[PDB]
């Protein structure tokens, strides 16, 4: 029952890694949002998201990471 402080230490150490890898906001970007899951054709789970950039590029990424689909539509 005393391991709650130990888990508090591992979430402080890993959130310290969230302080060094947030991962930091630097480059400005814009979003494109969608929901997906992969049946095959074995079965797995997950979700994806899309993004814009300041360099005009676009990327296909497993769902953010860090904050979630909570907000927003892009």
């Amino acid at each position: 029952t005393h391991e709650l402080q130990a888990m508090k230490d591992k979430i402080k150490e890993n959130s310290e890694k969230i302080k060094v890898n947030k991962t930091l906001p630097y480059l400005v970007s814009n979003v494109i949002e969608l929901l997906d899951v992969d049946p095959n054709d074995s079965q797995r789970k997950g979700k994806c998201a899309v993004i814009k950039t300041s360099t005009r590029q676009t990327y296909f990424l497993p769902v953010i990471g860090l904050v979630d689909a909570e907000k927003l539509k892009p």
Partner: protein
């Protein structure tokens, strides 16, 4: 405590880098598929082992690895602007009856739009081709924008408004493609409806050509033509068009097809203006003394908003006295006198057809 570690384990999945978007162009062999980055370099890579090329096909939006660039995951359809043109909402519905006149403007547009949707058999019963669009114009009288706005939430079904402004897109005004990019979901979400205000300034003539910003205009027009010039059937989309004048559009638009029907508004009759004041006099409560024809016979040759706003302005001009309820006395003065000032700039409002 445990949920925080869950968000930590969430972050243990996030160090994995996001892949690169891709469009599968065509294919060569099972290890080689023509693909291009959004920035233009074309590649041929291998797939992952779960997929069949029936799950890919040429001309398919996909994703690639960040190093091997291998085909892994995908989504068929995406875009930014589409749904964000949907969300404008008009109170009514019942605003249908709140536009006052006019019947053959009101009623015919129902037969022009509604019945095509529900009963295309009644088109093939006679054999007539379905009208795929509609056109308003003006502004004698007014209401071209609200009657649209009203019918959108009235007719219900699916409708998507086209904001006429941002299309120019600053750099590289090629955004006529976005109409296809919008038409593609109009072929997906079909049926769906489109209102367009201001087709005239995007109706550029290239009459006597000049400078630069006209060239991007006329080019953005060529697609609008070809999109309706198909090679395609847009019938499940209903294109509604209204603007200042139906003149500069050049004859390409002015023919049916692109412009399916001729509908417009004129100065509402004082008989119909008698009704336009009711929907103005409804939301305002006063002392019970009213003669509707008084303002109708005094105030003459106006528009619904012009009447209403000044009628409300009269109530606002009359409430300047700080008293609450106001008889038409002030209104038989204010609306009379105030609109006289408003009819000073009624000059030069009469435009070609």
């Amino acid at each position: 405590t445990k949920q925080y570690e869950k968000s930590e384990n969430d972050l243990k999945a996030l160090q994995s880098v996001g892949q690169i978007v891709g469009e599968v162009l065509k294919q060569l062999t099972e290890e080689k598929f023509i693909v291009k980055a959004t920035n233009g370099p074309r590649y041929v890579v291998g797939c992952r082992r779960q997929l069949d090329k029936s799950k890919l096909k040429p001309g398919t939006r996909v994703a690639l690895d960040m190093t091997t660039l291998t085909i892994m995951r995908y989504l068929p359809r995406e875009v930014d602007p589409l749904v964000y043109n949907m969300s404008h909402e008009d109170p009514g519905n019942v605003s249908y009856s709140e536009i006052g006149g006019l019947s053959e403007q009101i009623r015919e547009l129902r037969e022009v739009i509604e019945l095509p949707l529900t009963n295309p058999e009644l088109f093939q019963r006679v054999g007539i081709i379905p009208p795929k669009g509609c056109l308003l114009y003006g502004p004698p009288g007014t209401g071209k924008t609200l009657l649209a706005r009203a019918v959108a939430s009235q007719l219900d079904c699916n409708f998507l408004k086209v904001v006429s402004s941002s299309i120019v897109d600053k750099y590289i005004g090629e955004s006529a493609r976005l109409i296809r990019e919008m038409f593609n979901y109009a072929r997906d979400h079909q049926p769906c409806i489109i209102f367009m205000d201001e087709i005239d300034a995007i109706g550029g003539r290239r009459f006597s050509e000049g400078t630069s910003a006209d060239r991007e205009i006329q080019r953005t027009l060529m697609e609008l033509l070809n999109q309706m010039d198909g090679f395609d059937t847009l019938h499940r989309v209903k294109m509604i068009m209204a603007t200042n004048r139906p003149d500069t559009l050049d004859p390409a638009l002015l023919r049916p097809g692109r412009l399916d029907r001729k509908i417009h508004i004129d100065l509402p009759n004082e008989q119909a203006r008698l009704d336009i004041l009711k929907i103005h006099a409804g939301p305002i409560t006063k002392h019970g003394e009213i003669d509707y024809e008084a303002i109708v016979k005094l105030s003459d040759g106006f528009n619904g908003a012009d009447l209403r706003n000044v009628c409300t302005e009269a109530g606002m001009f009359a409430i300047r006295a700080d008293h609450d309820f106001v008889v038409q006395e002030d209104f038989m003065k204010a609306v009379r006198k105030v609109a006289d000032s408003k009819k000073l700039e009624s000059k030069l409002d009469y435009k070609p057809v």
